[PDB]
Design an enzyme around this catalytic site. Structure first.
Site, PDB file in Angstrom:
ATOM      1  N   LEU A  22       0.839  -1.213   0.000  1.00  0.00           N
ATOM      2  CA  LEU A  22       0.000   0.000   0.000  1.00  0.00           C
ATOM      3  C   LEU A  22       0.882   1.275   0.000  1.00  0.00           C
ATOM      4  O   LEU A  22       2.033   1.271   0.518  1.00  0.00           O
ATOM      5  CB  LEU A  22      -1.024  -0.022   1.156  1.00  0.00           C
ATOM      6  CG  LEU A  22      -2.010  -1.235   1.130  1.00  0.00           C
ATOM      7  CD1 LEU A  22      -2.922  -1.113   2.317  1.00  0.00           C
ATOM      8  CD2 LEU A  22      -2.708  -1.487  -0.188  1.00  0.00           C
ATOM      9  N   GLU A  30      -8.776   0.422   8.952  1.00  0.00           N
ATOM     10  CA  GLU A  30      -9.172   0.346   7.543  1.00  0.00           C
ATOM     11  C   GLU A  30      -9.121  -1.084   7.051  1.00  0.00           C
ATOM     12  O   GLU A  30      -9.992  -1.571   6.369  1.00  0.00           O
ATOM     13  CB  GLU A  30      -8.348   1.308   6.738  1.00  0.00           C
ATOM     14  CG  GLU A  30      -9.047   1.776   5.447  1.00  0.00           C
ATOM     15  CD  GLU A  30      -9.204   0.713   4.337  1.00  0.00           C
ATOM     16  OE1 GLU A  30     -10.298   0.721   3.705  1.00  0.00           O
ATOM     17  OE2 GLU A  30      -8.294  -0.094   4.006  1.00  0.00           O
TER      18      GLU A  30
HETATM   19  N1  LIG Z   1      -5.414  -0.439  -1.403  1.00  0.00           N
HETATM   20  C1  LIG Z   1      -6.238  -1.076  -2.230  1.00  0.00           C
HETATM   21  O1  LIG Z   1      -7.419  -0.776  -2.391  1.00  0.00           O
HETATM   22  C2  LIG Z   1      -5.667  -2.136  -2.925  1.00  0.00           C
HETATM   23  C3  LIG Z   1      -4.393  -2.007  -3.467  1.00  0.00           C
HETATM   24  N2  LIG Z   1      -3.822  -3.075  -4.166  1.00  0.00           N
HETATM   25  C4  LIG Z   1      -2.466  -2.944  -4.744  1.00  0.00           C
HETATM   26  O2  LIG Z   1      -2.473  -3.421  -6.097  1.00  0.00           O
HETATM   27  C5  LIG Z   1      -1.087  -3.645  -6.392  1.00  0.00           C
HETATM   28  C6  LIG Z   1      -0.966  -4.595  -7.586  1.00  0.00           C
HETATM   29  O3  LIG Z   1      -1.112  -3.854  -8.801  1.00  0.00           O
HETATM   30  P1  LIG Z   1      -1.893  -4.503 -10.047  1.00  0.00           P
HETATM   31  O4  LIG Z   1      -1.091  -4.300 -11.272  1.00  0.00           O
HETATM   32  O5  LIG Z   1      -3.302  -4.053 -10.014  1.00  0.00           O
HETATM   33  O6  LIG Z   1      -1.858  -6.070  -9.678  1.00  0.00           O
HETATM   34  P2  LIG Z   1      -3.117  -7.006 -10.026  1.00  0.00           P
HETATM   35  O7  LIG Z   1      -3.708  -7.503  -8.765  1.00  0.00           O
HETATM   36  O8  LIG Z   1      -3.974  -6.308 -11.009  1.00  0.00           O
HETATM   37  O9  LIG Z   1      -2.409  -8.245 -10.771  1.00  0.00           O
HETATM   38  C7  LIG Z   1      -2.750  -8.555 -12.124  1.00  0.00           C
HETATM   39  C8  LIG Z   1      -2.007  -9.822 -12.560  1.00  0.00           C
HETATM   40  O10 LIG Z   1      -2.834 -10.988 -12.299  1.00  0.00           O
HETATM   41  C9  LIG Z   1      -3.291 -11.492 -13.572  1.00  0.00           C
HETATM   42  N3  LIG Z   1      -4.558 -10.830 -13.963  1.00  0.00           N
HETATM   43  C10 LIG Z   1      -4.943  -9.604 -13.622  1.00  0.00           C
HETATM   44  N4  LIG Z   1      -6.135  -9.384 -14.169  1.00  0.00           N
HETATM   45  C11 LIG Z   1      -6.489 -10.472 -14.846  1.00  0.00           C
HETATM   46  C12 LIG Z   1      -7.578 -10.750 -15.560  1.00  0.00           C
HETATM   47  N5  LIG Z   1      -8.497  -9.791 -15.628  1.00  0.00           N
HETATM   48  N6  LIG Z   1      -7.742 -11.928 -16.174  1.00  0.00           N
HETATM   49  C13 LIG Z   1      -6.736 -12.889 -16.060  1.00  0.00           C
HETATM   50  N7  LIG Z   1      -5.604 -12.572 -15.307  1.00  0.00           N
HETATM   51  C14 LIG Z   1      -5.511 -11.370 -14.719  1.00  0.00           C
HETATM   52  C15 LIG Z   1      -2.179 -11.147 -14.536  1.00  0.00           C
HETATM   53  O11 LIG Z   1      -1.090 -12.065 -14.359  1.00  0.00           O
HETATM   54  P3  LIG Z   1      -0.699 -13.095 -15.544  1.00  0.00           P
HETATM   55  O12 LIG Z   1       0.564 -12.423 -16.298  1.00  0.00           O
HETATM   56  O13 LIG Z   1      -0.109 -14.403 -14.798  1.00  0.00           O
HETATM   57  O14 LIG Z   1      -1.828 -13.397 -16.451  1.00  0.00           O
HETATM   58  C16 LIG Z   1      -1.764  -9.777 -14.065  1.00  0.00           C
HETATM   59  O15 LIG Z   1      -0.364  -9.587 -14.318  1.00  0.00           O
HETATM   60  C17 LIG Z   1      -0.550  -4.328  -5.144  1.00  0.00           C
HETATM   61  O16 LIG Z   1       0.782  -3.863  -4.880  1.00  0.00           O
HETATM   62  C18 LIG Z   1      -1.480  -3.859  -4.037  1.00  0.00           C
HETATM   63  O17 LIG Z   1      -0.734  -3.104  -3.071  1.00  0.00           O
HETATM   64  C19 LIG Z   1      -4.535  -4.270  -4.318  1.00  0.00           C
HETATM   65  C20 LIG Z   1      -5.808  -4.389  -3.773  1.00  0.00           C
HETATM   66  C21 LIG Z   1      -6.372  -3.325  -3.079  1.00  0.00           C
HETATM   67  C1  LIG Z   2      -4.780  -5.984  -1.072  1.00  0.00           C
HETATM   68  N1  LIG Z   2      -4.689  -5.433   0.288  1.00  0.00           N
HETATM   69  C2  LIG Z   2      -3.483  -5.510   0.943  1.00  0.00           C
HETATM   70  C3  LIG Z   2      -2.318  -5.111   0.232  1.00  0.00           C
HETATM   71  C4  LIG Z   2      -1.072  -5.111   0.899  1.00  0.00           C
HETATM   72  F1  LIG Z   2      -0.048  -4.813   0.361  1.00  0.00           F
HETATM   73  C5  LIG Z   2      -0.937  -5.521   2.224  1.00  0.00           C
HETATM   74  F2  LIG Z   2       0.556  -5.521   2.875  1.00  0.00           F
HETATM   75  C6  LIG Z   2      -2.085  -5.913   2.941  1.00  0.00           C
HETATM   76  F3  LIG Z   2      -1.880  -6.306   4.340  1.00  0.00           F
HETATM   77  C7  LIG Z   2      -3.369  -5.940   2.292  1.00  0.00           C
HETATM   78  C8  LIG Z   2      -5.722  -4.552   0.708  1.00  0.00           C
HETATM   79  C9  LIG Z   2      -5.607  -3.770   1.855  1.00  0.00           C
HETATM   80  N2  LIG Z   2      -6.597  -2.840   2.249  1.00  0.00           N
HETATM   81  C10 LIG Z   2      -7.716  -2.712   1.475  1.00  0.00           C
HETATM   82  N3  LIG Z   2      -8.667  -1.822   1.902  1.00  0.00           N
HETATM   83  C11 LIG Z   2      -9.800  -1.695   1.174  1.00  0.00           C
HETATM   84  N4  LIG Z   2     -10.677  -0.793   1.592  1.00  0.00           N
HETATM   85  N5  LIG Z   2      -9.944  -2.348   0.036  1.00  0.00           N
HETATM   86  C12 LIG Z   2      -9.077  -3.273  -0.442  1.00  0.00           C
HETATM   87  N6  LIG Z   2      -9.321  -3.974  -1.556  1.00  0.00           N
HETATM   88  C13 LIG Z   2      -7.881  -3.461   0.306  1.00  0.00           C
HETATM   89  C14 LIG Z   2      -6.893  -4.376  -0.114  1.00  0.00           C
END
Ligand SMILES: NC(=O)C1=CN([C@@H]2O[C@H](COP(=O)(O)OP(=O)(O)OC[C@H]3O[C@@H](n4cnc5c(N)ncnc54)[C@H](OP(=O)(O)O)[C@@H]3O)[C@@H](O)[C@H]2O)C=CC1
Ligand SMILES: CN(c1cc(F)c(F)c(F)c1)c1cnc2nc(N)nc(N)c2c1
Length: 186
Positions: A22, A30
């Protein structure tokens, strides 16, 4: 199978991740909200199913994966089987949603929660249908290398309040944030 939802926490400059973490320091409540919203299912004898990209799956600390009390499905075209600890693998969002209709899952799954990454959010948000976005606005800019896609407010209505979601400003580690829920149906 019940509702389709995305859930994300986003900084003011639309960032969701930096180097598979994050952008902000851990906000414990959160994360507690994220857990509570994705895990809570109305429907007796079912669980919700979380869908995430492969990078999101590996960004969750191994201790926390699979996300307990939910069915965990990873998306990947490279992987040939679910990663260690995951339950299901699909090659696309549409495949995953279709799986949810198969016999294996049809009666097991309550709500479906998309939890990133950036491309899984975008395809969900732009596909026709009833979809809610649960969005935590982290009210500061943070250096990011992944971003949340544009929310089109012409179609996504911000709801004036929602049960189980606090409406006022939260603050942890000096960082103000708020929870929002958007709904489209098209
Ligand atoms: N704070 C938040 O709300 C959240 C933040 N995050 C952040 O997201 C960051 C990751 O970035 P991001 O690029 O989005 O990573 P993703 O989670 O989007 O990873 C995508 C990978 O998974 C596969 N993939 C993704 N989408 C598809 C699809 N639609 N169909 C088939 N395969 C798919 C592909 O791998 P392949 O090459 O093997 O096909 C692709 O390289 C993390 O570092 C995390 O910190 C994540 C969740 C929540
Ligand atoms: C994917 N994830 C996450 C990513 C990280 F890198 C971490 F180190 C972790 F503990 C959770 C995460 C964390 N907080 C979230 N909060 C909300 N509201 N929504 C998400 N999808 C989310 C995902």
């Amino acid at each position: 199978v019940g509702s389709l939802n995305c859930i994300v926490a986003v900084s003011q400059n639309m960032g969701i991740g930096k180097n598979g973490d994050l952008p902000w320091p851990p906000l414990r409540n959160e994360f507690r909200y994220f857990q509570r919203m994705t895990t809570t299912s109305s429907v007796e004898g079912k669980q919700n199913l979380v869908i995430m990209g492969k990078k999101t799956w590996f960004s969750i600390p191994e201790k926390n994966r699979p996300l307990k009390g939910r069915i965990n499905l990873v998306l990947s075209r490279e992987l040939k089987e679910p990663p260690q600890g995951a339950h299901f693998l699909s090659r696309s969002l549409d495949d995953a949603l279709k799986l949810t209709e198969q016999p294996e899952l049809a009666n097991k799954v309550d709500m479906v929660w998309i939890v990133g990454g950036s491309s899984v959010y975008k395809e969900a948000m732009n596909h026709p249908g009833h979809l809610k976005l649960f969005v935590t606005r982290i009210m500061q800019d943070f250096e990011s290398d992944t971003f949340f896609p544009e929310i089109d407010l012409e179609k996504y209505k911000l709801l004036p309040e929602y049960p189980g979601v606090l409406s006022d400003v939260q603050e942890e580690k000096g960082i103000k944030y708020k929870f929002e829920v958007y709904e489209k149906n098209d």
